[PDB]
Amino acid sequence: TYVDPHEDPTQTVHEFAKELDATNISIDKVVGAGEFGEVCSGRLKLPSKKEISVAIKTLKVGYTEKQRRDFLGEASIMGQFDHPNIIRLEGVVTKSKPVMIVTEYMENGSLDSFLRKHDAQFTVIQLVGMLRGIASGMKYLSDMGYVHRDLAARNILINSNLVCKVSDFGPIRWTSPEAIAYRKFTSASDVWSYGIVLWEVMSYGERPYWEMSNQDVIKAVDEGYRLPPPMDCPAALYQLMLDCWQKDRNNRPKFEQIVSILDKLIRNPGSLKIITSNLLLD
After folding, report:
1. CA distances (Å), 41 to each of 7, 56, 146, 207, in order?
2. Is 3 annotated as ligand-binding?
3. 28 is catalytic
4. Distance CA 134, CA 137 (A)
5. CA neighbor of 121 nearest in space, from 201, 196, 195
6. Annotation-wise, does 32 bind a ligand?
7. N or C: which end of the chain has fewer CB within 10 A?
8. What b/e readout covers 145-179, taking b as 16+ CB neighbours within 10 angstroms?
9. Domains identified in the chain and CATH numbers
10. DSSP SS3 for 164
């Protein structure tokens, strides 16, 4: 079970994050600005003397205590999870400044931007592998009782071997109608979001609902309209999207069911050969 850090939430950091010695951290490449400071990458020397690549984030000089709490809050959440499809927290540096969060290095970055660079260049089985990884991570998060609320291809990272991992543990296009309507956030609203991610992946990182007015995204979906099948989309995967986008949250599949559906498609790849701008009324 996941525990929400929220009455001295700062202690949650130490409970779920390793305090790293800066001696063991080196910076090789500055990526640029993040929400709370800089973002870069480098190397971490592990206690066994193994050396790994890592992503590193720093807290800006002259941070406010609120900024420090919000920044480190990411670690307090991420550190509770240990799963191959959830970004790994290597640790934090809090006993010296700048304060740091050190996480799993992912060579290929955010999934949406990666796919946009490679429009139509992967096989359907490669795409399904990416989607299965994401579903597996989400199955674990939901097993832990963690509702992500921000599941979207931009918040999935992809490594050198195309393994996809859920990130963003620190408005509208990815959110279920009930979560928009009255903040009803549940694992079933994450399943809705997963449906949107499935569409993003099969569309090679097209933006969900393009740049429709947000009020129209809300109204159209409420009226029963859904995103159209991506080009050359297997029927099985478009059906899976529609199932994730059921109006009644109780009728949506559970993440375990989504994983099993994709596993069956992986085992019987011939199933993917049945193939299915403007929204479609469903």
Report:
1. 33, 5, 28, 28
2. no
3. no
4. 5
5. 201
6. yes
7. N
8. ebbbebbbbbbbbbbeebbbbbbbbbeebbbbbbb
9. 1-105 (3.30.200.20), 106-282 (1.10.510.10)
10. strand
Place of tokens 């921000």: 150
35 is in an annotated binding site: yes
Q: What is the resolution of this structure in A?
A: 1.6
Catalytic residue among 70, 143, 150, 282: 150
CA dihedral 230, 232, 233, 234 (to 10 degrees): 170
Structure tokens at 41: 């990458």
SS (H, E, C) 189-225: HHHHHHHHHHHHHHCCCCCCCCCCCHHHHHHHHHCCE
Please state how this structure was obtained.
Answer: X-ray
Contact criterion met (CB below 8 Å) for 104 and 90: yes
Nearest residue to 36 via CA among 10, 75, 72: 72
For residue 201, give both structure tokens. 């992946």
